[PDB]
Amino acid sequence: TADELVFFVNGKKVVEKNADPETTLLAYLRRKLGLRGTKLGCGEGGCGACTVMLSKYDRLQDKIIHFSANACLAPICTLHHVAVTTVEGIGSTKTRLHPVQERIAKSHGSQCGFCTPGIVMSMYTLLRNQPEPTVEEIEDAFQGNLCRCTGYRPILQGFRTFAKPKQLRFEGERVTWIQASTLKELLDLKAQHPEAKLVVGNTEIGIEMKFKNQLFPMIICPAWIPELNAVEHGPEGISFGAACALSSVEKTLLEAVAKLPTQKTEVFRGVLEQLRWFAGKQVKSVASLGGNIITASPISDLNPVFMASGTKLTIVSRGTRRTVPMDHTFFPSYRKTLLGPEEILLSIEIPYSREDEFFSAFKQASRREDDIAKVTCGMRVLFQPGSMQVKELALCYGGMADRTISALKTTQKQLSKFWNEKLLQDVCAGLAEELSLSPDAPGGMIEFRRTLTLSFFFKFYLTVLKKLGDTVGRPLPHLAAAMQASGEAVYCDDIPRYENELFLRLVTSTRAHAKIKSIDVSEAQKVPGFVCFLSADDIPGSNETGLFNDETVFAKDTVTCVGHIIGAVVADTPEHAERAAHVVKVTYEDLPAIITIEDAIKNNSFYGSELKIEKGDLKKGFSEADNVVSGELYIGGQDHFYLETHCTIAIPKGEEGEMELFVSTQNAMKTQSFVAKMLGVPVNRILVRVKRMGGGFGGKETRSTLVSVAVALAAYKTGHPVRCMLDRNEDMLITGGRHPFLARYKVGFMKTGTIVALEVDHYSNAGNSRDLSHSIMERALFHMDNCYKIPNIRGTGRLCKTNLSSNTAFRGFGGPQALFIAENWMSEVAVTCGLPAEEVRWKNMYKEGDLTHFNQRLEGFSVPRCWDECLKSSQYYARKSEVDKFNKENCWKKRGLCIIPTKFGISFTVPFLNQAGALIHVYTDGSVLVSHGGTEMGQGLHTKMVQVASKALKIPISKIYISETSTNTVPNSSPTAASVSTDIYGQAVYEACQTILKRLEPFKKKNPDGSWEDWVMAAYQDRVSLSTTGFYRTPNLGYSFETNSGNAFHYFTYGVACSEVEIDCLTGDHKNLRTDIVMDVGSSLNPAIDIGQVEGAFVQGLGLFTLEELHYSPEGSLHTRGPSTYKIPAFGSIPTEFRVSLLRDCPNKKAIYASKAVGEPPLFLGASVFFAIKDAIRAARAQHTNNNTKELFRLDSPATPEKIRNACVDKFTTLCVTGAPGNCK
Amino acid sequence: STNTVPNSSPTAASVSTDIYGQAVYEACQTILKRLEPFKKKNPDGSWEDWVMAAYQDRVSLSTTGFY
Amino acid sequence: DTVGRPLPHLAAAMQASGEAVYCDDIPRYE
Ligand SMILES: Cc1cc2nc3c(=O)[nH]c(=O)nc-3n(C[C@H](O)[C@H](O)[C@H](O)COP(=O)(O)OP(=O)(O)OC[C@H]3O[C@@H](n4cnc5c(N)ncnc54)[C@H](O)[C@@H]3O)c2cc1C
Ligand code: XAX
Ligand SMILES: O=C(O)c1ccccc1O
Ligand code: FES
Ligand code: FES
Ligand SMILES: [Ca+2]
Question: Coiled-coil ranges per the record (chain C)?
């Protein structure tokens, strides 16, 4: 009794007879229509990997329009008579690439490639609306698109070349969906069924259903109704039907602002400001005005502005019609509006501003919670005619309570007062009082939020006043780049499903530390297509897993973090597995939990004892020092945010325990080992294949196996192929991240700035198993010197054992942590001594031939030339002057500049992992297939390996090919890690080539003018084998702690970065203005790959140090589980000027063709933004705080807007502006 | 498979046991040459021991063989 | 050392059970 759903994809008609309202367009494209170019990266609207173009008729506005949307939030039931275009839709390597696809690929804009299709579709959509866009439009187009690899620079450079009706009924398994064609039909429907839920854009509802497990068994979509879509210019303001997209609201209001007089458009420009950095295009194209309003989020950016301005709401039910201005009574409680259950919001009139009426809007440049504690506001003042005397005042704030509120007491007291200093004082006092937060108020950041309520008003108060009075060495693009841009590159979940293939959903601990009392599955057993539930009892081999045999495959008697895997559900579709998992009832008995580093130090909960490197005589160095500074420092962790999350397919053959797996991993050997150990089967039975990863970053070196083992078990149990791909929220919760570090330190120095003694005790938060924590701590200790000679030095480290997901490798592997701790105390030495930072860093540098604190010698120490050249090209000394000039001429905005070096040790710190295998075949057509132990994750290792094989063999690259990595071609491989993959695999590929060349030598002698093909065929026919292994092992490695000698590293990669920032001292926001990097990568095999690596790495570092903040409940539950609450760098995050140079004339005698590892060494240079920011904070504190020029103030990482703001101590932070006593002129 | 062993003659002429027998034997010998130093250090050890030790000493445990 | 021993075909038990995979026994993609 349901109507047929009919739409179009890439021009082809789709007729769906049994359309289920719960089906997203992304699930239908990938799993019904076999178009896998469009990706899942989050499922929540933040990342854009799932972008498509939608095309539909506005009957009203009378035209076919083209917009971008997130496929992951679009229900197919909204798509009746809509046309969809995917990346497959605009071109292909099979036919011919669209110019967009080709350009992103040739410009080096694609590394891993997983983001590239979403991005191609964002750019494609812009070009169909505007065939000649500006650079601003291009940039805005990419707002809702995230990339983890590239640093964005190349995509923008690349694309800059372009610049300058009857009711329908659908019936699902749970949901009945009605598409309403008329207003009348809506009201009747709402009257027959008051509980029925409206859905328009689905960008809120979709999240409630997916993430918060709500189920609305009746949905009415009223998007077709003309009255819900009208735009009407009236004499009071501009009315918008409640279904109007935010993009349409924005279009109209911008048209009104350019046309009408300034004085009429104050409200309008408020709405526009709130809409600026609001999601991206894909969301604004689908999100309705009315949906935002009725959602009534405490952190709605719109509702404070509508409340402040008395925006009119026309509200309707069958019979009833009424218009009210939005005021404080509109939101009576949490997520509620003053509407009756029958009632629906019809339109919204956004008023013109009057004479003597002024408006501002502001929002907090940070969000850390799903729906609370992000400050946002609309402010309105109306004066008596021609005067400065207050007649009306409205200050309405989100994120200061569980609903949008208005500061009524405060504003009331201002009536008839004049707009002056006293007024400012009275309002700030009102505000601090009326909006006061108890110290344990949900959301935290109490100080920062109070200070923002007041600083926002100060901006309004100042604004109102103003209103009155051989290819080696060649820039070869990634070999997969084109197919990555075309959506043709295969990633693990792009592999077709077998007819009998099943799906797995992890079942996860909701408690930090607890006994498992019972597990009940009877409600999961009722989900359609449930196959089975798996737990510890089902394992045929061993439940003992992990790098140090201290983990369970499945939890047994207790759980030890939130996300501790307990079991798994297997079902016939992934939605079925997802549903049935959320319904598995687990009964717990809480145990005492240990969460923070501090919790752990106080309870002595550690893995092992302290590690230590010590050299010199500390109680003596401190004797000789003129100056001794002690302190404590914290650095928060980081999520990998690989655009492709964890994924495994396991295929049980049914013979002799055989299993073939396809997996998103850096470590095929351990995946194989772990799978076999769990199964109780020899390693020779198990085959693991890796084509590519859509990102790794250290996060798929070991923790990939959490999914793999589980999936393989389901494959063993059921005997069907099984697969699982993690959602983003699962991925961030279970798989662990970068290690948070705590440091307590003490430096002894002279008045010159010469260091003479250092001790640092480092503590990492290692989480609920060992994993790579110990080696991570070792690498931290090897780097606590950065580039500096320290005669007397003691570094300890301790691994904190905690009820958190087990943390793991992350690009840098403990290095960034200790290098940051190191740049910190260096910064305090320069300030304390009253000398320029760059003079202090310079004087304390190692020289050629110096020995580290672990006694390794530094030969080819290139930091001096990197430094000298970075100073020169960045015009450092001139710009420094200009920063001082800026800071003397500006009160509430400050600039900051910093230049900082890096040294990063190259090799695995466990000697045995510095080995590598290759396997080379030459077929009788001369075509060569290379296989080696490395995996491709976007860093372009295969491209480099192709380039090396080609040089070595003296044949064009076109004759060489690499397909994939597999455990049956090269066994016992180390993980693709520690930046050495190009060194060690290149060497082994090189040896295999040499072996093949020596074998062809005699056929070469017999026919010196012969082609390669002739020689190969002559050697085949003479029965000379054309297949060989190659092998390499890094010589002279083996550091000893007990003797503190022998080489920990093969060589060191060096670099230097300069960064300039401007902070907003009233809000803690900042802009990255300019960064110059000079990097020593020896002689590069591929300048483009290597510059790509410097850039991507630098921007992952600037994330770590400034933007990325993970946040947990006191009970240890991760709160930031997606792009909405966790902020990785975005297109608009990178420095306006971003220059990277590779040092000329510096070959490396240690590695393949004089090249140097580049993957991880440049990530630390990201910290130049942090220390530039801190430099800006110093000037802000010299401005408003005190007069001590040598003041050491602590600043932890990440320097978010909260920490930057709270550190700009002033009359607001202190509350002196209220008339109180505090600290500040 | 063609990605493990390439350019193979068809399984024919009754010679397979003969020629692949020799090719398997030769590869087995190369392994034993590589494992001999670890045998001599620990004559009372197991197969498993010699293998782990060779791996940890970064000796390749993969080889081709040919006849 | 089994050379010269009448050891049964290694795959013979799976062949008798239906378990030994022949080309058409490989499952089809959807
Ligand atoms: C990635 C992303 C970023 C975002 N960023 C921001 C941001 O920065 N600032 C901000 O304020 N918001 C932000 N949002 C929230 C977003 O603006 C809202 O989700 C959106 O406006 C809701 O409209 P919709 O049409 O999708 O509503 P739906 O999800 O379809 O419905 C939302 C709710 O409104 C009800 N409803 C809808 N229309 C009516 C009607 N006319 N009458 C009565 N009830 C109705 C529905 O029943 C439902 O309860 C963001 C959302 C996403 C996904
Ligand atoms: N685009 C892209 N670039 C990337 C990676 C990625 O996933 N995607 N990851 C890093 C890491 S993190 Mo680690 O030591 O396992 S902590 S080392 C490492 C490095 C591994 O690649 P080689 O340079 O050895 O070939 O690649 C870097 N560059
Ligand atoms: O020393 C390293 O950099 C390292 C990296 C990955 C795994 C183990 C290790 O010792
Ligand atoms: S997957 Fe749709 S926005 Fe991330
Ligand atoms: S290339 Fe953009 S996420 Fe990897
Ligand atoms: Ca750990």
Answer: none
Report the amino acid identity of residue A324. Answer: V
- The DSSP bridge pattern shows strands A530-534 and A565-571 to be antiparallel
Select from A1132, A710, A1166, A630 the least CA-distant residue to A898: A1166
CA A542 – CA A546 distance, rounded (Å): 12
Q: Which of residues 318-337 of A touch C (CB under 8 A)?
A: none
State yes or no: A206 annotated in a binding site: no
Q: Which atom of ligand 1 is nearest to the CA of A301?
A: 11
Assess whether the C-beta atom of A577 lies below 6 angstroms from ligand 2. Answer: no
**A923/B contact by beta carbon, under 8 A:** yes
Question: By C-alpha distance, which of A145, A76, A68, A46 is closest to A728?
Answer: A46
Q: Which of A831, A853, A625 is nearest to A760 (CA)?
A: A853
Are A275 and A257 contacting, i.e. CB atoms less than 8 angstroms apart? Answer: no
Helix axes of A876-888 and A863-873: crossing angle, nearest 10 degrees: 50
The answer to whether residue B57 neighbours chain A at the CB level (below 8 Å) is yes
Task: Give dist(CA A937, CA B67) in Å, integer.
Answer: 38
Residue of B56, B58, B64 lying closest to A1027 (CB–CB):
B64
The encoded tokens of residue A336 equal 């509620």
**Cβ atoms < 10 Å from Cβ of C22:** 7
* Amino acid identity, position A443: G
Q: Which residue segment(s) compose the domain that A934 sits in?
A: 1-1225
Q: Whose CA is nearest to atom 8 of ligand 3?
A: A908
Count: domains in chain A = 1
Chain B nearest CA to A367, separation (Å): 48
Strands A1137-1142 and A231-233: unpaired
Distance CA A403, CA A398 (A): 7
What is the spatial order of strands in the sheet that A405-406 belongs to?
A357-363, A376-383, A390-398, A405-406
| Nearest alpha-carbon partner for A315 in A296, A294, A301, A331 | A294
Task: State how far the Cα of A603 lies from the Cα of A590, in Å rounded to an integer.
Answer: 18
Question: Is the separation of the CB atoms in A831 and A1192 below 8 Å?
Answer: yes
Helix (H, G, I), strand (E, B) or coil at A754: coil
The β-bridge partners of A14 are A7
Residue A41 Cα to ligand 4 midpoint, Å, equals: 5
Shortest Cα distance, chain A CAs vs residue B60, angstroms: 7
Per the CB < 8 A criterion, the answer to whether A697 and A1096 are in contact is: no
DSSP state of A309: T
Taking residue A864's Cβ as centre, other Cβ atoms within 10 Å add up to 17
CB atoms under 10 Å from CB of A350, counted, come to 23
> Is A310's Cβ below 8 Å from some Cβ in B?
no
* Catalytic positions of A: 1160
**Resolution expressed in Å:** 2.3
